[PDB]
């Protein structure tokens, strides 16, 4: 299990609060300036923190991510193998050579920033499709994740997972394709004006849908917990404003409440 | 006024919880990979947020801070005038030229990434002149300048404000300042996720000032001053450290004038 710091991301990835990223190709797609490559980097960073052992193969065609940017996202640049790329053909040739030099068990995350601005060498959609069909088996055989950014039967159905990200500050992530999560699930991702990626994103809304948080007064919020013995939802005594909920004293008891975790899996996780 | 989201850094800058950056040359110094430029970007970002008006004059000798990096720190790259520099001479030239072109009232923040890798064309003497050359513009035109200087009569005494940043989590030493006592130490944390913690140091400082105590080990309680009895009154509940990084914890303290005052007294130069 490789989970991130954002419980809403873990859900989008695995269907559960306690889940995380899988091996395979994940495409993060959407208009540019929606924080896609930051979400990508959060994932790379989590992988590299879980495995001090790991390296990141970083195929770069944008040149916006530098050592300083990586450090601020908590990625060690010393463990990043940087390959600038100017075409899909070159992307394919270099990925295949490196994926082939890797053994099952080695920790390696692939991050591609970005697919949509690479020339084949018109025939772009075709070449992109066959790049995916060529690299995806390696991801699965060698058991590694690959996160690809793509600024907006199609090529992206050769991927294992597709997130489409849009503007609702506030982002909506739409699960277009997944092995683990119901297609078309919508998750809310907040990015603060300081460019800060809220780890409490979407929790309060979701808990409100799932019943585990209610609203005694307008703009006030209360938790409700299922008592196994009496089959009733028991409110807490206390009432919170929305801003006081972004804290572990608020979320911690719910995250620990199995019914909350189960209501999330049942709402989102596949088969 | 221009405060930031990290109170500890509003205290380092101005000696109080409610203050922030002022006009002048601020140097951020210390070993590279200490989060100086993030720390610097945080201020550039608050300045530009408070003044949707403002432009950033970005003097760049490192090329580590790209448009994307800027956006992720909340600076709009469209409002950034980017100037590559390869020497102090060249940097002096462009700064004087662009500083000169500005009328008072125009909002401008200067960010220099960085100073220590620039050849002159006696490096330290060339540096001191540049400062003595540029700093009158900052005061006249009322603009802040944040300059990064990596460590691998000194010129730094020609700055208005010097922060030395090192690893303790980092410690910020105020080496020179108009507003806070010299040698003040502040704790800045950066979490595993590259997260610039806005609760940096507040716990240590409150423990120092006596507004937080430890009932048992690993537990923390707030104390408030009953200003009529002069007594320090504990709150009912205790909290582990991790429960404290929340507005529900710090908020009633930030509202409590005795806590605000204890902070000025420990950090703000008395004569303000």
Swiss-Prot record, chain B:
GO terms for biological process, alphabetical: DNA recombination; DNA repair; DNA replication
Domain of life: Viruses
Transmembrane intervals: none
Keyword DNA damage recorded: yes
Region of the whole protein represented: 31 to 342 of 391
Span of the signal peptide: none
Reported function: Important in genetic recombination, DNA repair, and replication. Possesses pairing and strand-transfer activity. Interacts with dda and gene 32 proteins.
Family: Belongs to the RecA family.
Designated name of the protein: Recombination and repair protein
Keywords annotated in UniProt: ATP-binding, DNA damage, DNA recombination, DNA repair, DNA replication, Nucleotide-binding
